[PDB]
Design a protein around this nucleic acid. Structure first.
Ligand SMILES: [Ca+2]
Ligand SMILES: [Mg+2]
Ligand SMILES: [Mg+2]
Ligand SMILES: [Mg+2]
Ligand SMILES: [Mg+2]
Length: 341
DNA sequence: GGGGGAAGGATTCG
DNA sequence: TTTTGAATCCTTCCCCC
């Protein structure tokens, strides 16, 4: 199996440079203004110029500005990015029927029927980079290898505007030298729990008792790692189907007065139904984020698809259930639909 | 014992 | 003034064979 991976570079920012070239070279930060107060909200992503000086995904727009008072600040235009993306993705489908769109900016291509070796792949990666650079003027990073994981790993080692290949040999190496927290799907909480066991590389998972690992990071993640450690990882590139759609919004002011929260819940639903677009959900969850930033949600499954009228009524019940079962005030309120027919 | 599914906190990645 | 927001992942609880 041969996997070619495409990761668009600093995507939201880049699309913004493409829409306004007079931005190339300058620091650009794509934000998500929450609305509570002047510049309240986080940073979605910034081009590399802005990353150098410490501005990056996650930090507050408030901090961001103290550091780069002149960097160009722009509101996240998700819609636009999503359309530009789809176009890019299509260009990809012209290189393999087996395509796994993973995110608005990542895609996996099983090209084990279009090349015979990594060289022929490399040349394909180059072809793909340039074809995307012409058509959409967007630079990307390619990662090629034996399975979706390492190909991604490859691409991280190269971005931006790069292209790398990890041969079955470098895999044996990485399995031995690569920091485990750098392995896809392994976040901070699991990275930590792994260092707390002395496990720092993929290999290390092989020298530990299984029921021990499983008890610390769960059965699924336990198996997932062991399988990589053994280079026994092969997972088909499959069409990924979104399994749930939702929306959650930050209220102007914390509260727990049912009638004050409703309007938001309802807008959250409307925006969610628009997004559902012909998909009929059989499950609804109302999600609340309390003042201390904790998350509390209550859902319910129906033996039939849910109409917008039903969502409205059921969501209020679930919201009440929340207020009853928790005393904290709500900061952000939202809804989530799933289990489509 | 375990199928199978419903719920809700947990974790990941932005 | 904090820390936006979207979606799956994991785990437990529960009914019934
Ligand atoms: Ca990217
Ligand atoms: Mg991404
Ligand atoms: Mg990590
Ligand atoms: Mg909690
Ligand atoms: Mg529970």
């Amino acid at each position: 199996m041969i996997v070619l991976f495409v990761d668009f570079d600093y995507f939201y920012a880049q699309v913004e440079e493409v829409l306004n070239p007079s931005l190339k070279g300058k620091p650009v930060v794509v934000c998500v203004f929450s609305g509570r107060f002047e510049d309240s909200g986080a940073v979605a992503t910034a081009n590399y110029e802005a990353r150098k000086f410490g501005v990056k995904a996650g930090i507050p727009i408030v901090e961001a500005k103290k550091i780069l008072p002149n960097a160009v600040y722009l509101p996240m235009r998700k819609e636009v990015y999503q359309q530009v993306s789809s176009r890019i993705m299509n260009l990809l489908r012209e290189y393999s029927e087996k395509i796994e769109i993973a995110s608005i900016d990542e895609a996996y291509l099983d090209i084990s029927d279009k090349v015979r070796d990594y060289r022929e792949a490399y040349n394909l990666g180059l072809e793909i980079k340039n074809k995307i650079l012409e058509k959409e003027k967007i630079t990307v990073t390619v990662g090629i290898s034996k399975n979706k994981v390492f190909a991604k790993i490859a691409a991280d080692m190269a971005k931006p505007n790069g292209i790398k290949v990890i041969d079955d040999e470098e895999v044996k190496r990485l399995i031995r030298e690569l920091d485990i927290a750098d392995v896809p799907g392994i976040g901070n909480i699991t990275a930590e729990k792994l260092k707390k066991l002395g496990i720092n590389k993929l290999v290390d998972t092989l020298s530990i008792e299984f029921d021990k690992l499983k008890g610390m990071i769960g059965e699924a993640k336990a198996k997932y790692l062991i399988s990589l450690a053994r280079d026994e990882y092969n997972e088909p590139i499959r069409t990924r189907v979104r399994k749930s759609i939702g929306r959650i919004v930050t209220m102007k002011r914390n509260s727990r007065n049912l009638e004050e929260i409703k309007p938001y819940l309802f807008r959250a639903i409307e925006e969610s139904y628009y997004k559902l677009d012909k998909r009929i959900p059989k499950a609804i969850h109302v999600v609340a984020v309390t003042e201390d930033l904790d998350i509390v949600s209550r859902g319910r499954t129906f033996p039939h698809g849910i109409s917008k009228e039903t969502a409205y009524s059921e969501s209020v019940k679930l919201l009440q259930k929340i207020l009853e079962e928790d005393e904290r005030k709500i900061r952000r309120i939202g809804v989530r639909f799933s289990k489509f027919i």
